[PDB]
Amino acid sequence: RTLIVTTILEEPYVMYRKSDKPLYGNDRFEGYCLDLLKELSNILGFLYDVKLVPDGKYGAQNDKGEWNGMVKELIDHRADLAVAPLTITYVREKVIDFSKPFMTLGISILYRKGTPIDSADDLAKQTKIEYGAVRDGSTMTFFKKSKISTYEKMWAFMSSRQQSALVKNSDEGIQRVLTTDYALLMESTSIEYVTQRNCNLTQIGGLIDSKGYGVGTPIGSPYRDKITIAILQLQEEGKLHMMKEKWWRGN
Amino acid sequence: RTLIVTTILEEPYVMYRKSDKPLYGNDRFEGYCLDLLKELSNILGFLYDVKLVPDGKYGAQNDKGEWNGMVKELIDHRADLAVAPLTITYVREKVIDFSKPFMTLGISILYRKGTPIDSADDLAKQTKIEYGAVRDGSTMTFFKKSKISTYEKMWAFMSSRQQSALVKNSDEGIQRVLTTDYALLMESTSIEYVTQRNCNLTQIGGLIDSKGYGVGTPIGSPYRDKITIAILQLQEEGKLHMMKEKWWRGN
Numbered sequence A, B: 001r002t003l004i005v006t007t008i009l010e011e012p013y014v015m016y017r018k019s020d021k022p023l024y025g026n027d028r029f030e031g032y033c034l035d036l037l038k039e040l041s042n043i044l045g046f047l048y049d050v051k052l053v054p055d056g057k058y059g060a061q062n063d064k065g066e067w068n069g070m071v072k073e074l075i076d077h078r079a080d081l082a083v084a085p086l087t088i089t090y091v092r093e094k095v096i097d098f099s100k101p102f103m104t105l106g107i108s109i110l111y112r113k114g115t116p117i118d119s120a121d122d123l124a125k126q127t128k129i130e131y132g133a134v135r136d137g138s139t140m141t142f143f144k145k146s147k148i149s150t151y152e153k154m155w156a157f158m159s160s161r162q163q164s165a166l167v168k169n170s171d172e173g174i175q176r177v178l179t180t181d182y183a184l185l186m187e188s189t190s191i192e193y194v195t196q197r198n199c200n201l202t203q204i205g206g207l208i209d210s211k212g213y214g215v216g217t218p219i220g221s222p223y224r225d226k227i228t229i230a231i232l233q234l235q236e237e238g239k240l241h242m243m244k245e246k247w248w249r250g251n
């Protein structure tokens, strides 16, 4: 069985290689997730074929309980594995299985260096410095659903200054940080990626929530536990660390 | 079925309550893991009986491939679950199953506030400041097995200054930090716990490795996936955050 692997274009996890060389199949891609998949394929001994998810989505549910994205590919048995920056969540675990996480992360703060600011509590109580998140993204939703008083304050501040504090995407938010007095709340993984490439920018404080990216499989898949095993081996042998450094390290 | 839960005395996860009131069974204990277990017991609907592991050990293997600690309790079917600060590792996954992690952590640096020191790379290249770990503990072993050049340098420095840099236990190491020019490499969870209670001490840099604590079960247990589900619900609903703050927050 050649395993069909669903994934999604997302830098630096999955990208088309910058080459016009005759590269076919899996060879057309590169990135953290491609390196992970090679390691998994060597530990477990499976052949695989990478297929980008046709609708370009991660996976969310509608009211009929209909799914889309990589999640739907697994539900329909069109893919055997999903290897992507795909968050392990309660709702998704209802319909697919996940390996244990190959990467842990959480919401954090992107801001300029040299400022007395040290946490979200420092941002919350003031207003001279604007702070927000990408509109309708995982980070905005966390704040909106939060019942922790300090994040409740941060939300009301975002949603009131709605038109200005909530950016359209990460690019815009990053632009806003460099060009004005603004702090972007985003996934720690993304922040590390930007800070490595922008010496004017830095991460503020620690992690605001916690979640992991895991390899998705259909419910009952005999590969899920094997992939957890392989992930633990890679972590313990320092290979996940080097794979992250390979793709994250900047100039 | 009343589930038998193995666990281990370890502050602030599991402690005897400071009371001479007539408390029996599970009521004799308190701590993060007791609160987690109550939440799990309410989400899943199970009765349980907490039993401290008789040999007081987490779980390690000997040459005959014989295990001890909470791991051995699960292997022998004397316990249905292990709920403790028990790290999910490749070797243990060979003999027991684990839920996904309820807490993520990694090795980090405990040091005084106000010093220009910002990471392990800052410690590695110098020698005016001693730095080490608890002798024969998980953190020492990581450095000893490491193939990352910068941690290879940190190890040779520890193992040469062996008699002085490698402390006997966390208490001693913490004492060494407060009373001399020394930095202790220890689990981030433990560091946060100390820093909350010692305003003279602080965490340096980020996480050096990554691992999680999970609930252990025998291989094949029908409770493992249910516990992962409950854990994700608790995380997403901010309950793991509040349980951690309850036990970690200092004066």
Ligand SMILES: Cc1cn(C[C@H](N)C(=O)O)c(=O)n(Cc2ccsc2C(=O)O)c1=O
Pocket (backbone or CB within 6 Å): A010, A058, A059, A085, A086, A087, A088, A133, A134, A136, A137, A138, A139, A140, A170, A185, A186, A187, A190
């Ligand atoms: C790499 C990556 C994947 N994903 C998809 C997400 N992990 C998922 O599984 O649906 C994501 O939401 N963000 C964060 C994000 C993207 C647009 S807004 C936003 C946020 O953090 O709010 C990412 O950075």
Ligand SMILES: Cc1cn(C[C@H](N)C(=O)O)c(=O)n(Cc2ccsc2C(=O)O)c1=O
Pocket (backbone or CB within 6 Å): B010, B058, B059, B085, B086, B087, B088, B133, B134, B136, B137, B138, B139, B140, B170, B185, B186, B187, B190
């Ligand atoms: C709470 C806790 C559990 N454990 C046990 C460990 N999680 C295990 O699963 O065996 C541990 O090794 N440390 C760290 C530790 C203890 C003595 S030395 C040391 C270290 O970090 O080297 C802890 O702080």
Ligand SMILES: [Br-]
Pocket (backbone or CB within 6 Å): A098, A099, A100, A228, B098, B099, B100, B228
């Ligand atoms: Br799992």
